[PDB]
Amino acid sequence: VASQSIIAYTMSLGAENSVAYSNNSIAIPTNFTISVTTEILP
Amino acid sequence: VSMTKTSVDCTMYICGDSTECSNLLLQYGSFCTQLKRALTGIAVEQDKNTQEVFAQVKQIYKTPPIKYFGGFNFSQILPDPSKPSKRSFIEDLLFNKVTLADAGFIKQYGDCLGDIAARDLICAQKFNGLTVLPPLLTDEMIAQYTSALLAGTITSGWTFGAGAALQIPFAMQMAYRFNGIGVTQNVLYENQKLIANQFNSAIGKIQDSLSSTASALGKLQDVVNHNAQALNTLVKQLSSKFGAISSVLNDILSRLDKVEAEVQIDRLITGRLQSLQTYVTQQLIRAAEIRASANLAATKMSECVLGQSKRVDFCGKGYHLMSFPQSAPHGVVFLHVTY
Amino acid sequence: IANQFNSAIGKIQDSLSSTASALGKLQDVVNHNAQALNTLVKQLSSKFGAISSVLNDILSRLDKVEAEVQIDRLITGRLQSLQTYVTQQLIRAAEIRASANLAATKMSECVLGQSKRVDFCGKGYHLMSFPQSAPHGVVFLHVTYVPAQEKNFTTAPAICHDGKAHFPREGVFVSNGTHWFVTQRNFYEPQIITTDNTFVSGNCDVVIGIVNNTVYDPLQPELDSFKEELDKYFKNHTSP
Amino acid sequence: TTDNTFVSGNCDVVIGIVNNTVYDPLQPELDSFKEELDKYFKNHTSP
Ligand SMILES: *[C@@H]1O[C@H](CO)[C@@H](O[C@@H]2O[C@H](CO)[C@@H](O[C@H]3O[C@H](CO)[C@@H](O)[C@H](O)[C@@H]3O)[C@H](O)[C@H]2NC(C)=O)[C@H](O)[C@H]1NC(C)=O
Ligand SMILES: *[C@@H]1O[C@H](CO)[C@@H](O[C@@H]2O[C@H](CO)[C@@H](O[C@H]3O[C@H](CO)[C@@H](O)[C@H](O)[C@@H]3O)[C@H](O)[C@H]2NC(C)=O)[C@H](O)[C@H]1NC(C)=O
Ligand SMILES: *[C@@H]1O[C@H](CO)[C@@H](O[C@@H]2O[C@H](CO)[C@@H](O[C@H]3O[C@H](CO)[C@@H](O)[C@H](O)[C@@H]3O)[C@H](O)[C@H]2NC(C)=O)[C@H](O)[C@H]1NC(C)=O
Ligand SMILES: *[C@@H]1O[C@H](CO)[C@@H](O[C@@H]2O[C@H](CO)[C@@H](O[C@H]3O[C@H](CO)[C@@H](O)[C@H](O)[C@@H]3O)[C@H](O)[C@H]2NC(C)=O)[C@H](O)[C@H]1NC(C)=O
Ligand SMILES: *[C@@H]1O[C@H](CO)[C@@H](O[C@@H]2O[C@H](CO)[C@@H](O[C@H]3O[C@H](CO)[C@@H](O)[C@H](O)[C@@H]3O)[C@H](O)[C@H]2NC(C)=O)[C@H](O)[C@H]1NC(C)=O
Ligand SMILES: *[C@@H]1O[C@H](CO)[C@@H](O[C@@H]2O[C@H](CO)[C@@H](O[C@H]3O[C@H](CO)[C@@H](O)[C@H](O)[C@@H]3O)[C@H](O)[C@H]2NC(C)=O)[C@H](O)[C@H]1NC(C)=O
Numbered sequence: 001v002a003s004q005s006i007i008a009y010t011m012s013l014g015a016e017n018s019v020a021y022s023n024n025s026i027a028i029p030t031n032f033t034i035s036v037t038t039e040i041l042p
Numbered sequence: 043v044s045m046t047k048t049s050v051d052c053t054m055y056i057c058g059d060s061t062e063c064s065n066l067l068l069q070y071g072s073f074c075t076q077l078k079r080a081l082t083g084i085a086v087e088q089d090k091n092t093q094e095v096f097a098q099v100k101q102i103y104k105t106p107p108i109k110y111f112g113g114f115n116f117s118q119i120l121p122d123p124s125k126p127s128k129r130s131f132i133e134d135l136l137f138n139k140v141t142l143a144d145a146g147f148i149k150q151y152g153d154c155l156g157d158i159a160a161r162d163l164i165c166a167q168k169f170n171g172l173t174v175l176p177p178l179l180t181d182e183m184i185a186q187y188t189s190a191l192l193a194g195t196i197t198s199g200w201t202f203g204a205g206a207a208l209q210i211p212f213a214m215q216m217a218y219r220f221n222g223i224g225v226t227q228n229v230l231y232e233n234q235k236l237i238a239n240q241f242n243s244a245i246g247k248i249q250d251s252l253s254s255t256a257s258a259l260g261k262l263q264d265v266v267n268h269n270a271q272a273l274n275t276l277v278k279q280l281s282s283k284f285g286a287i288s289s290v291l292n293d294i295l296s297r298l299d300k301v302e303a304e305v306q307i308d309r310l311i312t313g314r315l316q317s318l319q320t321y322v323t324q325q326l327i328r329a330a331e332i333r334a335s336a337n338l339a340a341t342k343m344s345e346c347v348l349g350q351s352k353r354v355d356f357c358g359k360g361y362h363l364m365s366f367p368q369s370a371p372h373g374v375v376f377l378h379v380t381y
Numbered sequence: 382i383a384n385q386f387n388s389a390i391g392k393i394q395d396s397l398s399s400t401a402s403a404l405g406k407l408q409d410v411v412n413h414n415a416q417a418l419n420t421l422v423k424q425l426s427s428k429f430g431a432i433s434s435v436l437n438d439i440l441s442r443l444d445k446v447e448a449e450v451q452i453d454r455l456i457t458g459r460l461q462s463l464q465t466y467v468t469q470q471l472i473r474a475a476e477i478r479a480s481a482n483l484a485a486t487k488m489s490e491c492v493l494g495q496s497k498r499v500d501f502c503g504k505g506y507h508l509m510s511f512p513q514s515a516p517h518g519v520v521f522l523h524v525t526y527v528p529a530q531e532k533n534f535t536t537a538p539a540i541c542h543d544g545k546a547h548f549p550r551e552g553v554f555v556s557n558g559t560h561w562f563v564t565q566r567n568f569y570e571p572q573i574i575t576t577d578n579t580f581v582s583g584n585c586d587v588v589i590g591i592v593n594n595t596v597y598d599p600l601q602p603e604l605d606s607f608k609e610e611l612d613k614y615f616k617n618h619t620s621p
Numbered sequence: 622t623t624d625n626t627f628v629s630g631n632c633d634v635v636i637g638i639v640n641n642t643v644y645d646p647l648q649p650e651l652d653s654f655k656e657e658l659d660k661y662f663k664n665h666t667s668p
């Protein structure tokens with residue numbers, strides 16, 4: 001048994017991430033993606 | 043970036059808790075709900091402005107446990123766990139150099155009962171149907187967004203703006219910058235310990251400058267002051283008479299009867315309602331002037347923090363290397379770094 | 382790159398077909414111009430203190446001396462209603478002018494050019510954009526290169542060889558764990574470290590974290606094949 | 622050097638052009654490759 005109801009919550013700002021930084025490590029993309037995005041202006 | 047999210051209740055402002063005036067306000071029609079709709083339009087936009095300046099980052103980035111970045115010393119711009127709100131050291135200067143007249147948080151009447159309501163004008167604004175609403179993003183959340191924009195910048199340069207964050211050693215990121223301003227990267231590595239000392243000294247001068255004068259944050263304090271001046275002017279406008287026998291409805295209703303009392307009340311409604319049409323016009327004009335600043339601040343966030351700028355004098359004075367955002371009450375401070 | 386672009390622009394059909402809410406920023410302009418005029422025409426029902434809001438009732442029921450004192454209440458409130466509408470329209474018009482100047486700037490810099498501006502012409506490194514018209518607006522299709530499938534590499538700011546320090550001409554040094562290469566910064570495409578992949582300045586003591594590797598000289602093995610051509614001539618020349 | 626610079630035209634079209642040497646990084650080692658050739662010829666008189 002389950003049912004829809006109003007909830008309240010503290011909003012999330014985004015997913016958590018820690019960057020793997022080190023003073024001799026670099027990350028380089030081996031591939032790419034081409035992406036199309038709409039921007040709408042009055 | 044934003045200004046105080048005010049709201050007004052026109053029945054309480056124009057003539058609260060008198061039915062004898064409420065029944066005359068309706069002769070004018072929707073002039074109240076147009077003003078409530080206009081002020082709600084502004085109040086919803088302040089959270090859009092705060093979202094578009096700070097929420098530029100996909101993910102909440104954390105800096106590594108070992109705080110070594112090629113000798114550059116970010117210790118006063120990064121957050122420290124020890125404070126209740128996880129603001130940086132320089133954000134804690136800025137948060138104190140601007141004094142908020144009313145933050146908009148809860149007021150449990152225990153202040154507004156007794157003597158403080160005679161000594162306080164904010165409680166007297168509340169009693170006249172004028173209120174300040176809180177922002178959606180708290181000063182912890184804005185500081186958290188700022189710590190993610192800053193952690194991304196030092197651990198990954200522009201790459202977290204264009205795609206996923208890609209780590210690169212800070213001295214090589216700064217070398218990629220040097221190439222960007224047309225100074226070949228060997229000039230950085232041959233001077234790295236000098237360049238670090240120069241930056242670490244320049245960051246030290248900002249702490250002292252912000253500890254030494256208040257007048258530099260005038261652009262933020264002036265916004266708080268113009269909001270507070272407007273709600274103070276709007277509550278003083280209750281004391282005017284507009285050609286009526288009194289400025290107080292309780293006197294007009296205690297001293298007259300309906301057939302000529304309604305002739306005094308028409309003057310006070312017409313005056314008070316004009317006193318709102320003016321306030322809402324000043325706020326709409328202020329709201330547009332602030333937006334034109336929040337869109338500039340978002341444009342500097344994208345083009346100075348998430349990138350490196352060729353625009354002359356856009357991202358500080360000099361040839362731009364990089365910039366760090368810091369949150370301030372109703373605003374943003376950019377620490378633009380330049381060669 | 383064509384199949385990526387062709388399939389990406391295919392999702393724009395669905396992003397527009399499937400949801401109702403995609404053009405909310407333009408619908409809001411129409412909704413505000415409608416709700417402002419619908420408000421302005423309801424204000425004709427307000428009495429402003431007169432005995433009727435219908436101006437012909439005043440003119441049916443009263444003579445000039447007190448008809449004009451009722452009419453003037455309606456002239457005053459109606460005139461204020463227009464003054465409110467025209468002030469609101471001037472305030473909105475000055476916001477739509479800012480959006481038009483931004484849109485003319487995006488047309489100039491994203492469409493007629495290519496922009497280095499970060500996130501100005503959509504997220505990613507900007508390639509190009511296509512304008513499409515809409516009622517009371519413009520929709521830009523921005524096309525961007527977005528990096529993908531990254532790998533960790535070890536790196537160094539310089540390579541040390543003949544006691545001299547070598548720096549990348551363009552790109553960055555990387556190691557897969559056993560060999561050292563130059564690669565361009567934005568796309569992994571490794572090459573042997575050479576005299577042409579690099580430029581030189583100073584001895585290997587000034588730079589911090591400099592690493593030891595050979596640097597290949599594209600002239601030397603070919604000059605050496607010319608030494609062996611000279612050497613076979615010398616050995617054969619012992620016979621005449 | 623001939624690495625630092627690129628050529629175009631001739632010295633009569635530019636205004637305020639100045640004379641100088643321009644060095645060639647290939648020559649000194651190609652000339653060491655002449656000293657390598659020349660020593661081998663002088664020695665090869667003996668076999
Ligand atoms: C870079 O990313 C590309 C995807 O964004 C990727 O292209 C895709 O490659 C895979 C195979 O590796 C293809 O997948 C199909 O392959 C065959 C059928 O042709 C089937 O066995 C598989 O199950 C699957 O259906 C994709 O079709 C292909 N996509 C496109 C648009 O070409 C590249 O391979 C990546 N390049 C590098 C160097 O990693
Ligand atoms: C980055 O810059 C910081 C500011 O200069 C610096 O922190 C400062 O470091 C000194 C030396 O440790 C502290 O001096 C105090 O040291 C201890 C603290 O318990 C006391 O015994 C001393 O009497 C003296 O007061 C500064 O107080 C400290 N300042 C702050 C704001 O923390 C960092 O150390 C620098 N980072 C690196 C890696 O060098
Ligand atoms: C480029 O400009 C730099 C300053 O912006 C300059 O760095 C400064 O160099 C002087 C010495 O020339 C240092 O002065 C200190 O030197 C020793 C102690 O190490 C003492 O004898 C002196 O009394 C004095 O304390 C500065 O400390 C140094 N500043 C920094 C931030 O490192 C460079 O030397 C200039 N380089 C060139 C090639 O012009
Ligand atoms: C790091 O990248 C290196 C270059 O891709 C790679 O080295 C290459 O490894 C292959 C074997 O996997 C060698 O192949 C040679 O095998 C024999 C060796 O005697 C020869 O007969 C063949 O002709 C062929 O040349 C490559 O020669 C070798 N390249 C070099 C320049 O040495 C490494 O294996 C990579 N390391 C890691 C940890 O992935
Ligand atoms: C990177 O390669 C360098 C070149 O091979 C290498 O330098 C060599 O380092 C050793 C140890 O420091 C030096 O050895 C000398 O050290 C002192 C005199 O300075 C004496 O006690 C010793 O007997 C000996 O003479 C070498 O002289 C030096 N090579 C040269 C040409 O000077 C680096 O150590 C290498 N580094 C890494 C991390 O691989
Ligand atoms: C740059 O170097 C050039 C080459 O050395 C040099 O050009 C030479 O200029 C002189 C003077 O104009 C010429 O001398 C001749 O002038 C007339 C005939 O034209 C005669 O009266 C002279 O006796 C003599 O023959 C050279 O012919 C000319 N050489 C070449 C190859 O063009 C420039 O003058 C130098 N300029 C500077 C500013 O240093």
Ligand SMILES: *[C@@H]1O[C@H](CO[C@@H]2O[C@@H](C)[C@@H](O)[C@@H](O)[C@@H]2O)[C@@H](O[C@@H]2O[C@H](CO)[C@@H](O)[C@H](O)[C@H]2NC(C)=O)[C@H](O)[C@H]1NC(C)=O
Nearest residue numbers: 018019020021022025027028106530531532533534535558
């Ligand atoms: C890049 O590597 C880090 C961890 O360092 C690596 O450790 C070895 C396994 C080897 O790959 C070395 O060459 C590297 O130095 C990765 O970060 C970890 O990611 C896992 C999830 O995949 C996570 O559980 C750990 O907590 C992470 N550790 C840290 C310190 O962040 C990182 O994901 C790698 N990046 C990519 C693009 O693959």
Ligand SMILES: *[C@@H]1O[C@H](CO)[C@@H](O)[C@H](O)[C@H]1NC(C)=O
Nearest residue numbers: 021022023024108110111112
């Ligand atoms: C970076 O270099 C410093 C100074 O040599 C060193 O203390 C630190 O351990 C290095 N960082 C990492 C992640 O090891």
Ligand SMILES: *[C@@H]1O[C@H](CO)[C@@H](O)[C@H](O)[C@H]1NC(C)=O
Nearest residue numbers: 613614615616617618620621
């Ligand atoms: C050796 O020199 C003779 C000419 O003296 C020539 O015919 C012959 O092809 C040469 N061979 C080689 C291997 O150089």
Ligand SMILES: *[C@@H]1O[C@H](CO)[C@@H](O)[C@H](O)[C@H]1NC(C)=O
Nearest residue numbers: 660661662663664665667668
């Ligand atoms: C001359 O050639 C011989 C081999 O024929 C070699 O032993 C000798 O060292 C060479 N000397 C010089 C100076 O090249």
